[PDB]
Structure formats: C-alpha cells, structure tokens
Design a protein around this nucleic acid. Structure first.
Ligand SMILES: [Mg+2]
Ligand SMILES: [Mg+2]
Ligand SMILES: [Mg+2]
Ligand SMILES: [Mg+2]
Ligand SMILES: [Mg+2]
Ligand SMILES: [Mg+2]
Ligand SMILES: [Mg+2]
Ligand SMILES: [Mg+2]
Ligand SMILES: [Mg+2]
Ligand SMILES: [Mg+2]
Ligand SMILES: [Mg+2]
Ligand SMILES: [Mg+2]
Ligand SMILES: [Mg+2]
Ligand SMILES: [Mg+2]
Ligand SMILES: [Mg+2]
Ligand SMILES: [Mg+2]
Ligand SMILES: [Mg+2]
Ligand SMILES: [Mg+2]
Ligand SMILES: [Mg+2]
Ligand SMILES: [Mg+2]
Ligand SMILES: [Mg+2]
Ligand SMILES: [Mg+2]
Ligand SMILES: [Mg+2]
Ligand SMILES: [Mg+2]
Ligand SMILES: [Mg+2]
Ligand SMILES: [Mg+2]
Ligand SMILES: [Mg+2]
Ligand SMILES: [Mg+2]
Ligand SMILES: [Mg+2]
Lengths: 152, 208, 100
RNA sequence: AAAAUG
RNA sequence: GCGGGGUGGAGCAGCCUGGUAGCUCGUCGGGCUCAUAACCCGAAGGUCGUCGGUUCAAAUCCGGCCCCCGCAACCA
RNA sequence: CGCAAGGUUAAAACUCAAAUGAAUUGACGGGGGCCCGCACAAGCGGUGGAGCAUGUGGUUUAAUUCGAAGCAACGCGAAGAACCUUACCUGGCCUUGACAUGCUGAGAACUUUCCAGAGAUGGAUUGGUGCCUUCGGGAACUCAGACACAGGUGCUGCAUGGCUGUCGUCAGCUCGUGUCGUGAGAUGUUGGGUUAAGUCCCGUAACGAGCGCAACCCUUGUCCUUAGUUACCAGCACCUCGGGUGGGCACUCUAAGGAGACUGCCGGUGACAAACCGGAGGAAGGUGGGGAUGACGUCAAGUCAUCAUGGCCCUUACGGCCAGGGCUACACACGUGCUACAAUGGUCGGUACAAAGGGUUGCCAAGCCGCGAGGUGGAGCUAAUCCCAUAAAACCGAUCGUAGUCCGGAUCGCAGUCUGCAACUCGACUGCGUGAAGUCGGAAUCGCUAGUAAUCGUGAAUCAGAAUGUCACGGUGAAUACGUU
C-alpha cells in the first residue's frame, strides 16, 4: 500500500507437535479452507518420514527447509528503454515462505499414490538436495549470478 | 447527484407516519388502499381549502381522520353541514364509521406544502418566478424559519429550453438527522407544460 | 396499463369469483380415486363446457393504482414504484428504511 | 520504451 | 539445342545426408483502442506438375510426358 | 547593379470581415513537485479452451412486440412469456364502443343448467317483479337509439415534471462585507506542518458565513437493571429417566432502558501548538467492524412504456372482442454464470454442530400404499408452542488406484409422477439404459487486504407450476503487502 499501516496477525496453532514452522506449512498446504485434510496429509507424510528415516522428522523437515531456502533472486526492473533483471538478496522472512511455496508446488505434481508419500519423497530429496525444488532454486541462483553485471 | 427523500430518511427518528394504525395480511392492502383513495379524494375535492396534512387513525372497526388546514370556516360553514355531507361521502370508501376533526395551523407561511402550492398557483397566472420565490422566502424568513430553500424547474417563462432556479436563506442542513426539514413538492400545469416546485424549511434542532 | 386492460382483467376477476365453488366440486370429483369413469367423464365434460375465463391461472394481478403487471408486491396492492412514493410520503404504516 | 489520425 | 526449376490462393524452406512438410504475404475469426490505422494471437488451406522405375519405404534419386524460366535463337 | 545566384526601387486587379497585441479563467502536455485509491508490485483464486443456462448482435420468419448501446447496455425494464400477461402475426367478429357525464324509452340484476360456432356472439330460457313512496315517482341495475365523445404501450426524453446512472463517497463548491486591478478577475480558499477529510495549529488584507467532511441514525462486539411464556434448567423432589412433571429466578435466551472508548493516563518527539511513535488498564484504542447518508455541477446521459404532461397524429380504427402461432427459430459472433476435466477425490455404513424466514382461499405432520417422483388420511398451528424441515462441507471405518476410469455428465430411447381446462411447438422432477466433449485451457483479461478471498449448505420475493438469475443467512477458513519507478 501507500500507508505502511497494515498489521501482522500472528497465527500459531500447532495441535500436538507444537511447532511454529509446521503451522505456516499447514497454512500453505491448506486448500479451499480444508484444515483437517491438510492436517491428515501433512501428518501422514511426517509419519512416512519417521518410519523411513531413523532421525526424528522434525530435524529432517528443518534441514530440508534450510537446503531449499534461497539467498538471492532476480527481479525485473523497468529502466525506460530496455528489459533488465537485477539480483537482490532475499528478506530474511521471505525466504521461508519461498521455500514453503516451492516445496508444496513441486510436491503437488508427482503422480504417485497420494500427497503423503509425495511430501515424504520431497522432504527426503531436499534433506540433502536431490529434489527438483533444489534444482530450480539453483537455477534461480544461477540466473542471479549470470545477471551480476547490474548487481548494485 | 440524486438526493434522498428528506422526509423518508427521517421517518421513525423525528418524523411521524401520517397513517398510523395496525393490521395484518387479511386487510393490510385493503386499509392501505382505502387510505390512499381517501387522501386523494379529500385533496381533489377541497383543493380550494388550504389543506396540508391528513392523518388517519384506525382503532377497532373505525377511522378517525384529522385534517390540518389554515381556513377552518371553509369546512366548518354555518355549523358544518359540510362535515356531515363529507362523512356521508367518506362512509363508502371505508365501511367503518368515520370521524372528522378539523385542526387549525398557526403561521401558514411556515408550511412547506402551503408555500409550494401558493408558488405554483402564482406561476399558473403567468407571474414571473423570481418575484414569487423572493416574496415566499421573505415571508418565511420574517417569522422564525431558521432556513428555507425554494427550487423551481421547467420551462420558466416560455422559452423552449427548460432550466432550474433556486434561492436559499439561512441554513438548511440536509445531512444532519437531528433537524426537522419540512419538505414539499408541487406542480403547475401551464400552457407550455409542467413546472415543478420544491420547498425545504428548517425549523430547529430536535434536542432530547 | 391501458384502461381496457384494467377493465378486461376486472372481467377475469369477476368471472372467477362468481363461480368459485363448481371448480372445487369438479376437482374434488376428479381427484377422488373411488369415483368411477362414469362419474369422472361427465365431470370432465362439465369442466370443458364451462367458460375458460374462470380460472386462477387466467388471473394476472396488477397495481390497483395504475395496473402495472410487473413489479408487484402482494403484501401491499401497489406496484414497484408507487410503493416508494407512498413510503417516502409516510403513508405506509410501520415502514422505514433499513440498514442493519 | 512506443503513440499516425478524428 | 544449353542450364536451371515445378511444393496451401501468391512467393520461398524442407533435396545435398531417402524414414521428421515449415515459413512470409493473403482469407476468416478473435484480441488492443473512445474508434480507426498499425500491431498481437489462433483456424482453414499443399499427402509434395504427372507416370513408371530403384528401394522395405520416396517431397529427397533414375528416365518419359507437360509446363515455367536464364539463354541463345522468333520479328507482323 | 551582379558572371551567376540574385539584390534594390516597387504596383494593380481580385478576395475576406477580420488579421493582431497584452493579460484573465479553465482545459490540456510524450512539463515539473507533493499526495491518494487492489492502480501497480507482493499473493490467492478465476475468464478466454469443453458442454449446458441466460442476454445481446446478425440472419430467417407471418410475427421473432417495444426499450436499454464505451466505462455509465448485454441473468438489463422482466421480483416468473404454455392460455392470460401481450403490446406482434394469421383469421374471425364489433362502431358512443371494454369505461365515465349530459338526453329519451322499456324493464331486476339473478337464475333459467339448452342449442349453432375453435370463440367472441346469437337465439329459446321454469321462477319473482322488486325497495321507499306527496304511493304521483325515484334510486341503482339490464338493454336499446343521437351528439357532444370515450379511447391509443401512437410520435417527439432535443418541448417537460417526477424518478435514476455516472464522475464519486473524491474533498471539494461558493457567498456577504472589506481590499487590489481601467477591466475580465483576484484575495479569502495562498505558506509551514498534521489528518481519511477546506480535519486541525500557528502565521497571514482579510473578517465572517453557507452547502459539503465529521457528529446525530441502524446493526454487531463488554457489562448492569427490568421480565420469565410458548423460552431456560444451576439446586430440591417426583421420575415411566423425556424440562417428562412439581418448581426455580441461577444461567442462557428474548427486548426495552442504560454505563463503556472520549487521546482518557504514562514515556518519547514535535514550532514545548496541532499532532505523531510505543506502553498500562481495557472486551474493545486511536473516525473498533459493517450499513444508510451522494455537495456545486457534467454527460441536450436514461425513461413519453410506471405515472403525469405542451404539442402533432387515427376515428368502420393506429380504438375494442375471441381462437391459434411468436417472443423459447439458427450457417455464426459477443457478455454474464453453472457443471467438470478427479486420489487435498467418486461411492458405501453409521454418526456432529448453525443462522435467517414463511404459513387459515395457508402450512399441511402420524400411520399406511408405491423403487421413486408421489397417493389416502387428517392432527396441530392464527404461530418462541404445529408445520415447512433431516443442513452440508467436517470425522471415522470398507472400496476404487489414476484408467476418458467406480471421473465427468450433455445428448438420446422407453415408461412415469405433480399442478394447471389444457406440458406438441413450449414446464419441472422420477425409474431403467446408452453414454459424448472434457488431460486445467493463446493473445488478452477479472475479483479480492481478514471471518476477506476460496469452498459447503439454508431461506424469501415474483409465483397454479416454472431459478445455474436476484435478494438475504450461516459452517470451515487462507496466502501476501520491500515499496511508489
Ligand atoms: Mg391511461
Ligand atoms: Mg400467472
Ligand atoms: Mg488522412
Ligand atoms: Mg473535430
Ligand atoms: Mg495570447
Ligand atoms: Mg494537465
Ligand atoms: Mg499485481
Ligand atoms: Mg467459454
Ligand atoms: Mg468462445
Ligand atoms: Mg431486443
Ligand atoms: Mg448482474
Ligand atoms: Mg390471446
Ligand atoms: Mg436527456
Ligand atoms: Mg428527464
Ligand atoms: Mg476598483
Ligand atoms: Mg491571476
Ligand atoms: Mg481562481
Ligand atoms: Mg487563479
Ligand atoms: Mg469574488
Ligand atoms: Mg469578493
Ligand atoms: Mg477551491
Ligand atoms: Mg480564488
Ligand atoms: Mg469545513
Ligand atoms: Mg457524515
Ligand atoms: Mg443513492
Ligand atoms: Mg439523448
Ligand atoms: Mg433513447
Ligand atoms: Mg426474449
Ligand atoms: Mg481496501
């Protein structure tokens, strides 16, 4: 807007795990106002992660998130005569939402049985970085690096 | 832009309904139709008499009509056989027994309907509008009347291009609701068509 | 909303109101299951020979002031727009503009 | 960045 | 007689390396605009001059027929 | 005169009623400076691709009745076209007429249950002549005859009133006196701040005022009192374990009257002003949320078809009555929606919680009969009591395993149900079966800042029947805003 008066309502409604990042992932994965469906999907994926990896799924989710969080991104700018793209570093808050959005978007289109094992596969892949989300993050990064002549 | 009806938006707050009674689905339409017909008939017959407000009160199986006018002798003439013939006329519009009360109003030149009708009837006699409107505003302002606005629209004079004129005096706050703006409209059927008259009168601020 | 339209719909009103029971009798005969075709066919013929302009489906209620067919509120007897005039003038009892 | 006419 | 060439309504890729018909202008329809022009986006439109032959298979290669050119050479 | 280019001196016919200078108000600029708005940006979800509904353009027709046309027309007048509506076409039938007033004459309307015709209409048609009389006659009714007429959804919204859209819910628009200018005009209304605001402060040839902003109004969120029926049930009891009963005024709830929030207090800043940034208390804090309220005027904006109205127009018809047909046609194009293209789902079984409203020419329960749409039946309710009427999405368990499919439902065939005199043109639902396009959609384009977007259901109006439209009510419930190029 033009005022900068908009507030920031805080939502932290983790039922049993008591995690903040999990709550925002819930809000991201929720569709058409179906909270219960999101709860069941995310918890099934989490339980699959647990039954697969001996490590506790909390830290696996955290390290998958921290391996998909970008640092800089390319943004278009209207110079008045040319189509230019400038690299800008991410705001510390925005990278979490970017990672969540990328993860859910890439998980939505696997083609396997259900989003339980879809999100399970994505979390395992991004835990060390063999998922498509990490590849596209690296592609965005290499855009930003190849457009470093502007930088500023 | 279009202005809301000043009397409509003040109904319930400071204005009062002219037809006050109670009914149900069986005879709500019947009672309402009877009231409109009786008001139309009264105005059409005693248009010569300066009648302003007609109130209808309907207790059980009866109707009590109170008429506001500035010339009571016209209806109360030589002990008011006019009243009885009027009752006989009214008895058929609504089958219930009728009851007529004639109410006198002080200061007829502070009443919106009377002022509008006077202006219209002056216009019908080919009196140019500016003098009539100025004298109406003068008379109203000379006694109380903390505000008055008069508007006349149509084919003023005889020119074949309609236009609008209006004069105001005092203050006439329409957006406020504590005020009691008396408002009236009337028409004049001259040889060139219809000329419309609107009058707003602001009397005071209703406190309490 | 011609004069003729109002007169000729008053005609429908009058004809429908004037019989007002024979239709009920014949429909009771027809609707009753145990009536026999002998007592059903004569009722059919009675319904057929009776004038067509005496039915509820043949009536279109209009404004009692002008006769506008569309925009009718059967709570009142008024059309779409004379309701507004009457309400603003204050003739309609108990009616105010609502916000809630 | 482009942009002639009524 | 010499050389080149025949491919949507018009003009050119696809030919060399046989297996994979595209492009520009037109027609139609829709976009952008207060409206037109200019622009932008879709759809239709050629199974590849013709026939045989080679090949498992020919718009891609070998002959005949028909036509078009650059030619010389025709000048009523 | 000049080498040439050309320079210098210098007319006329003809043609127009102007050409021109300086300044003023507005508008505009691919001039500039500040500021605002889902205007961008940051996000979510769509339209444009499919089928269907609905309106419009075009074409066709005897007619597809008129009006609305950039935003500000196109689920619009129409909150209900099978007959009517209805205004159009075909055909048939009326001329003081379907209606009102003036004149004359004869008589009750009613009910006569009949015939000719698609029908208006016509003809027989049991029965009573009626009410009050200065008892002479009159009223009102039915019909007949003559004119003055009655009639028109006929034309003109560029002759009008009234009503409405739009800029725009943007903060602007003016006047009195004074002053400056020969004047049109200008000051007030400019400046520095601040605000959502011409809101406020101080300055200041201006001093004041009005219409606007804000406030007064409705609703919601906290609490107190009043009051407990058809409403409620903490405590006692009865108990056939149902507020079912005695009973209670506890609570909720219903609806009237009232308190509360006013920058009130604290810290910081600020011209120690207005005001700004945090904090306590507080249910709510900075016009708490939403609605009604639309200034001077603009578009010769819309409407003569709601109504009224100055003209002009027809009188055997451009006025009336009736039966059928059309407005629902169809090589195409456009706007607005619904259902989908599935596994954050399709079915199967049992299971949980809302708000709002309508009902005596009405709602219409129980039992019973039918696969069903539905049928008999009649209780109760003039409604906090009875009915409409069981909310759905949600949760759990079984199944389907991504296949044009246990997806999707158009189209189509056969037989039904309901209202209506009558469902062929041309209604809605029901049973069986067939089962299409559709793999998330180019250019382009739309809505939305918090109980919001998205998604699921419920009610009302119009109405014999006919909602994917309109208006209204709740359940679940997001992401995003660095900022103004
Ligand atoms: Mg009329
Ligand atoms: Mg009807
Ligand atoms: Mg030109
Ligand atoms: Mg011009
Ligand atoms: Mg000049
Ligand atoms: Mg400008
Ligand atoms: Mg955007
Ligand atoms: Mg479409
Ligand atoms: Mg299309
Ligand atoms: Mg049309
Ligand atoms: Mg709409
Ligand atoms: Mg007809
Ligand atoms: Mg106009
Ligand atoms: Mg007008
Ligand atoms: Mg002077
Ligand atoms: Mg000046
Ligand atoms: Mg000025
Ligand atoms: Mg100026
Ligand atoms: Mg001045
Ligand atoms: Mg002045
Ligand atoms: Mg100003
Ligand atoms: Mg000025
Ligand atoms: Mg002010
Ligand atoms: Mg206000
Ligand atoms: Mg308004
Ligand atoms: Mg116009
Ligand atoms: Mg027009
Ligand atoms: Mg139509
Ligand atoms: Mg907003």
């Amino acid at each position: 807007p033009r005022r900068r008066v908009a507030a920031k309502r805080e939502v932290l409604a983790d039922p049993k795990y008591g995690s903040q990042i999990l709550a925002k992932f819930m809000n991201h994965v929720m569709e058409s106002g179906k909270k219960a469906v999101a709860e069941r999907i995310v918890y099934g994926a989490l339980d699959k992660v647990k039954e697969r990896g001996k490590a506790d799924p909390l830290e696996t989710f955290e390290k998958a998130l921290d391996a998909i969080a970008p640092l800089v991104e390319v943004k278009s700018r209207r110079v008045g005569g040319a189509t230019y793209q400038v690299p800008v570093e991410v705001r510390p808050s925005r990278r979490n939402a970017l990672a969540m959005r990328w993860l859910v978007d890439f998980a939505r289109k696997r083609g396997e049985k259900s989003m339980a094992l879809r999100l399970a596969g994505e979390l395992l892949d991004a835990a060390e970085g063999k998922g498509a989300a990490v590849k596209k993050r690296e592609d965005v990064h290499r855009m930003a690096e190849a457009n470093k002549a502007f930088s500023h | 832009g279009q202005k809301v009806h000043p009397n409509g938006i003040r109904l319930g707050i400071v204005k009062e309904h002219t037809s006050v009674w109670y009914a149900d689905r069986k005879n709500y339409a019947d009672y309402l139709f009877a009231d409109l017909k009786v008001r139309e008939y009264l105005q059409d017959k005693l248009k010569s008499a300066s009648v302003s407000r007609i109130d209808i009160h309907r207790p059980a199986q009866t109707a009590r009509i109170t008429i506001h006018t500035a010339r009571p002798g016209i209806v109360i003439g030589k002990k008011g056989e006019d009243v009885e013939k009027l009752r006989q006329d009214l008895t058929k519009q609504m089958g219930v027994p009728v009851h007529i009360n004639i109410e006198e109003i002080r200061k007829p030149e502070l009443d919106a309907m009377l002022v509008a009708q006077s202006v219209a009837q002056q216009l019908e006699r080919r009196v140019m509008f500016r003098r009539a409107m100025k004298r109406a505003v003068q008379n109203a302002m000379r006694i109380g009347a903390k505000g008055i606005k008069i508007q006349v629209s149509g084919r003023l004079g005889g020119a074949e291009i309609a236009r609008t004129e209006w004069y105001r005096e005092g203050r006439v706050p329409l957006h406020t609701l504590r005020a009691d703006i008396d408002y009236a409209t009337y028409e004049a059927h001259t040889t060139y068509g219809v000329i419309g008259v609107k009058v707003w009168i602001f009397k005071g601020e209703v406190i309490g | 909303a011609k004069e003729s339209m109002k007169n000729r719909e008053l005609k429908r009103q009058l004809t429908v109101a004037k019989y007002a029971k024979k239709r009920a009798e014949l429909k009771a005969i027809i609707a009753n299951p145990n009536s026999s075709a002998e007592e059903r066919w004569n009722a059919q013929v009675a319904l057929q020979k009776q004038p067509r302009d005496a039915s509820a489906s043949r009536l279109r209620n209009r404004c009692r002031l002008t006769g506008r067919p569309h925009g009718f509120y059967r709570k009142f007897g008024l059309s779409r727009n004379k309701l507004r005039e009457a309400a603003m003038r204050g003739d309609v009892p108990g009616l105010v503009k609502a916000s809630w």
